[PDB]
Amino acid sequence: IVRFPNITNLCPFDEVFNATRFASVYAWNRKRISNCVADYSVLYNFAPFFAFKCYGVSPTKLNDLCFTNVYADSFVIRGNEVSQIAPGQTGNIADYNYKLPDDFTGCVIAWNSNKLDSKVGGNYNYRYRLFRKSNLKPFERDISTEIYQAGNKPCNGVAGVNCYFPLQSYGFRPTYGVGHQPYRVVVLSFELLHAPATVCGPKK
Amino acid sequence: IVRFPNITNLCPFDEVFNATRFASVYAWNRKRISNCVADYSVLYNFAPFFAFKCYGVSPTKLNDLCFTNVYADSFVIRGNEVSQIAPGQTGNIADYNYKLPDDFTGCVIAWNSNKLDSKVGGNYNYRYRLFRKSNLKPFERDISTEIYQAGNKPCNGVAGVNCYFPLQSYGFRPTYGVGHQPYRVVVLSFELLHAPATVCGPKK
Amino acid sequence: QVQLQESGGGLVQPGGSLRLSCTASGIALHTHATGWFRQAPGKEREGVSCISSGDGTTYYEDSVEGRFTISRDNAKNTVYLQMNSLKLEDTAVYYCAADPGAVCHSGSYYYTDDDFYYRGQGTQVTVSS
Amino acid sequence: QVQLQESGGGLVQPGGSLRLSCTASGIALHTHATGWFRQAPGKEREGVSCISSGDGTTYYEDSVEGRFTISRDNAKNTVYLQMNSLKLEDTAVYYCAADPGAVCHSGSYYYTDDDFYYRGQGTQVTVSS
């Protein structure tokens, strides 16, 4: 607390919340925020947030309790699918794309992004996974794009009827209804007091 | 030799335990018991008490000791807030409604009253206070009903957002679980051997 | 003088979504337990959802599981019903109600027996065309 | 890479009935939203129908309503336009197309805006005496 009031590494929250382009759900990027002081105040002055929800830690007491190895990951989903980003839920995203552990502590953030991740005539870039063989363990990323056999007839690598690609793109247009705009979602995840703490922030 | 003075009547302990209706916690009734003989055997043949816990005296020994200025006060709470009626306890009742001193010499008696103090559709005649400016000092009764200001906006005009009514009612319904059924509580407080005695009990 | 005021509703096309809002003037939330009921023309009223007093355990009916969500914001003293994937037989009027205590499913009780102490005027949703 | 194939057409009389079939191979229906468009000679194209997602919430336009019925089977993955009691001006070429998401009137967007993905090759119809 010498040269400046310490405060050297400010934690890289600004590039995560404010980025030029996010990734799809099936290819969600993931950050390794460590070795800094975590100012949990800059996220509030960002946007009129649509969802600020978490369990086990309370939004005003993140400053005065601290921990180590906080994780931040980002993707964009449909408006009617924000409810599936929570522990214990089921659905297309919550079972085939992105699953949370049942005992999860960390804060999930969502805001509307019509003006940035949508365009006239369809933005056919942001995709999601639709079929697979089985369910998903929590915190997994699946990239593989092979044919899926849905019927009794075994389908080869050639595309045919009853065998389908697992990837379909959200067709984003600015004139959709409320549940069908893109909503950029970032999810924080961290453990409470079971390891040598590294990131704690300036004060309370 | 043992000498005790001349006393006629038998104390109104049946009058305070067997009454038509009790009082709410925010306005607990208080009765002064003096100039009688305190035979604490009408207490035992009353009900299968949920809790009979005495601080500073042992429950068999109250006949063959005596004291002064014994105080009887009564109110009605629910199941899970019985443990809050104790010295050194915190909670909604204990900090805002009824506070006991840390050095307490008395007994706490509670029993279930689901059959009497509950009715179908809810019994809304038993209230408790949610909000004050600060905590409550021991043995203070707070009856004043004024609007509590929770937000920064000064709500002078009554009944608006972030300016709340200070009293909430218990909703007592007969089909509730044991943790939310009403419980009649009677607390006895007296002082042990620093003042001349006025109530003693069995003469000999 | 405690009023519960609702906003939302309108003409929504099937596959759409709304967000109904119920606001409390006099009372405060996170001490009460608020819920949503609905009335169809020619039908009786049935429950939709419940949230309890502290923290909040969310209780949903057999017609609307996995589609609807309930969420309470105590900053603006509002409770919110996010309805998703609306089918055609959801045309009804929706009421929000509040009752003191952790009222829904305490013991052998459940909130479908409509006896809540505070009520509201209601908003109309219409899923058709 | 993903191909969608049509069948039907021929020499029919007014009042005749036929069953146009759009067969999808690469992509699956009951998740995409398909519809039908037509092109008469000397005119501008316009839609005939649109099935949304998996529920099925049939749309028709004013010039074509009351005579066509649209249907989809999910076993064979082939959307069907059942045609009944046509008139003489329905001579055109019919194209089928499918766009991901519930595209049929998902808010302020109507599928007459033909920025529509996976266009097909089409089948020609003739009605005459």
Numbering used by the authors:
A (entry chain A), B (entry chain B): 321 to 524
C (entry chain E), D (entry chain D): 1 to 129
Authors' text:
The SARS-CoV-2 spike protein is the top target for antibody therapeutics. It is a homotrimer on the virus surface, consisting of three copies of the receptor-binding S1 subunit and a trimeric membrane-fusion S2 stalk. During viral entry, the receptor-binding domain (RBD) in S1 binds to its host receptor ACE2 on the cell surface, the spike protein is cleaved by host proteases at the S1/S2 boundary, and S2 undergoes a dramatic structural change to fuse the viral and host membranes. In this study, we discovered a novel nanobody, named Nanosota-9, from an alpaca immunized with the Omicron BA.5 spike protein.
While three Nanosota-9 molecules bind to each trimeric spike (which has three RBDs), their distribution is asymmetrical: two of the three Nanosota-9 molecules crosslink two RBDs, connecting one standing-up RBD with one lying-down RBD. The 2:2 binding mode of Nanosota-9 with the RBD creates three distinct interfaces. The major interface between Nanosota-9 and the RBM buries 835 Å2 of surface area and is dominated by strong hydrophobic stacking interactions. The minor interface involves the RBD core, burying 237 Å2 primarily through hydrogen bonds. Additionally, the interface between two Nanosota-9 molecules buries 196 Å2, featuring fewer interactions than the other two interfaces. Due to the relatively small sizes of the latter two interfaces, the 2:2 binding mode of Nanosota-9 with the RBD may only occur in the context of the trimeric spike. Collectively, these three interfaces stabilize the Nanosota-9/spike complex by locking one RBD in the "lying-down" position and the other in the "standing-up" position, rendering both RBDs’ ACE2-binding sites inaccessible. This unique binding mode enhances Nanosota-9’s anti-Omicron potency. The Q489R mutation likely disrupts these favorable interactions and introduces clashes between Arg489’s long side chain and Nanosota-9, explaining Nanosota-9’s inability to neutralize BA. Docking a human antibody into the same binding pocket as Nanosota-9 revealed clashes between the human antibody and the spike protein, indicating that this binding site is not accessible to human antibodies.
